[PDB]
């Protein structure tokens, strides 16, 4: 039961009440407002299923039932482990329900400005997430595309990649470092996902071939044209189709 | 609660009050103005999230809650570490909210008149910034273009550069000094950003080549025309295309 103080006094809660102050009435059942107390409205607790969460933001300094202090302008998710149905405070301005972001085995998502250890958003950064993880988005965060599918690929399929961010001796599946802006193909009987640093460029496709058959190609790094033949052969990281001129 | 002195006296704050003086009332809750005090308006604290800041400027000499003195015409940002929501003073004229300038890994920005150690703006100068840094602009500062993207480039890509500011034995990636106004190409499997001194001129592009094929070129420094052939070859810092005349 939301209330207001029309005069300085003490409420049944026993809190000191300055004029114009507002406060909740936790008590269940029929309740009589005090002569200074003024009725406003009943405040329903927001439903909190495992699939749902409740974003909140402090209007000013205070403390929640769980004892966590809330400075002005702070924002926080409300998980089910806390309460099955939290009741918003007079200083807890709701921003809205946050649906859970589920992921499939073949799904992954890039979170813009991933939440730091500090609890402050990390501006100018992004963080990939995968592995059937299901999680509510932290405040101030958003997906770039909305749960990208994993690029599963076979030996006849291949994907070019480029290092937007220089130096990655680790993390890469080949465990090989790369200079910024260089390209390299990946291929094999496996699924793959782009890293936060590397970015996809183009998808090489199967190029069926038989004996006494092939295609002209060119090594752009040195201009080396040559006619590949025989067995099926996907283009490497730099080779490109070359055109004959009769 | 903003107020004014209609007569010389002392306020509840205990400050000496000359006629026409104005002052804040920090106290929360209901408050009765004094017979000399005159009601004006409630003054809300500006919201201060990590992404936001509040620019301010002194109208005259005074002191803030944090004890920092403010001479007339001085300007200062208000960060969240100070207060979650600062309340403007009668002498603190607001100039406006300042949004944070976030940067990506591939982003960088040039600040005109970068803030000095003195706290005064450095006229006629500029300062590059990069590395996913996120920062509010200092007063009197502005970007030249608005967060330029880093020039990532491969071995087949190259960018010409020119020394607008003479002598740079350090800072340059090659660690080589240059006379003012000279040009030199840069190339390799790496990202690159212009320095505050050096400026980009043109972007050399890949020039595919094979055996028994090439292009005429000319060395402008000495007029030396010659026909490069064979392997792929990007133009150097001075060579330019030369035209055959049958």
Curated annotation (Swiss-Prot), chains A, B:
Required for normal vault structure. Vaults are multi-subunit structures that may act as scaffolds for proteins involved in signal transduction. Vaults may also play a role in nucleo-cytoplasmic transport. Down-regulates IFNG-mediated STAT1 signaling and subsequent activation of JAK. Down-regulates SRC activity and signaling through MAP kinases. One of its GO terms (molecular function) is identical protein binding. Keywords: Acetylation, Cytoplasm, Isopeptide bond, Nucleus, Phosphoprotein, Repeat, Ribonucleoprotein, Ubl conjugation. The vault ribonucleoprotein particle is a huge (400 A x 670 A) cage structure of 12.9 MDa. It consists of a dimer of half-vaults, with each half-vault comprising 39 identical major vault protein (MVP) chains, PARP4 and one or more vault RNAs (vRNAs). Interacts with TEP1. Interacts with PTEN and activated MAPK1. The phosphorylated protein interacts with the SH2 domains of PTPN11 and SRC. Interacts with APEX1. May interact with ZNF540. MVP 3 mediates interaction with PTEN. The keyword Repeat applies. GO terms for biological process: cell population proliferation; ERBB signaling pathway; negative regulation of epidermal growth factor receptor signaling pathway; protein activation cascade. MVP repeats lie at residues 1-44, 45-99, 100-150, 151-206. Coiled coil: none annotated. It is found in: Cytoplasm; Nucleus. It comes from Rattus norvegicus (Rat). Phosphorylated on Tyr residues after EGF stimulation. Dephosphorylated by PTPN11. This is Major vault protein. GO terms for cellular component: cytoplasm; cytoskeleton; nucleus; perinuclear region of cytoplasm; ribonucleoprotein complex. Its main location: cytoplasm.
């Amino acid at each position: 039961l939301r209330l207001r103080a029309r005069k300085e006094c003490f409420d049944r809660e026993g809190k000191g009440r300055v004029t114009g102050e507002e406060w909740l009435v936790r008590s269940v059942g029929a309740y009589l407002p005090a002569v200074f107390e003024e009725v406003l409205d009943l405040v329903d607790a927001v439903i909190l299923t495992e699939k749902t969460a409740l974003h909140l933001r402090a209007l000013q300094n205070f403390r929640d039932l769980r004892g966590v202090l809330h400075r002005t302008g702070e924002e926080w998710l409300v998980t089910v482990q806390d309460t099955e149905a939290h009741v918003p405070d007079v200083y807890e301005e709701v921003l809205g329900v946050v649906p859970i972001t589920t992921l499939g085995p073949r799904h992954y998502c890039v979170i813009l400005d991933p939440m730091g250890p500090d609890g402050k958003n990390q501006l100018g950064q992004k963080r990939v997430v995968k592995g059937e993880k299901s999680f509510f988005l932290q405040p101030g965060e958003r997906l770039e595309r909305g749960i990208q599918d994993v690029y599963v690929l076979s030996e006849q399929q291949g994907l070019l990649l480029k290092a937007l961010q220089p130096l990655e001796e680790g993390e890469s599946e080949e465990k090989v470092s790369h200079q910024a802006g260089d390209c390299w193909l990946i291929r094999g009987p496996l699924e793959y996902v782009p890293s936060a640093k590397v970015e996809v460029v183009e998808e090489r496709q199967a190029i069926p071939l038989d004996q006494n058959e092939g295609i002209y190609v060119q090594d752009v790094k040195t201009g080396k044209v040559r006619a590949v033949i025989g067995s099926t052969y996907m283009l490497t990281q730099d080779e490109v189709l070359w055109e004959k001129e009769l």
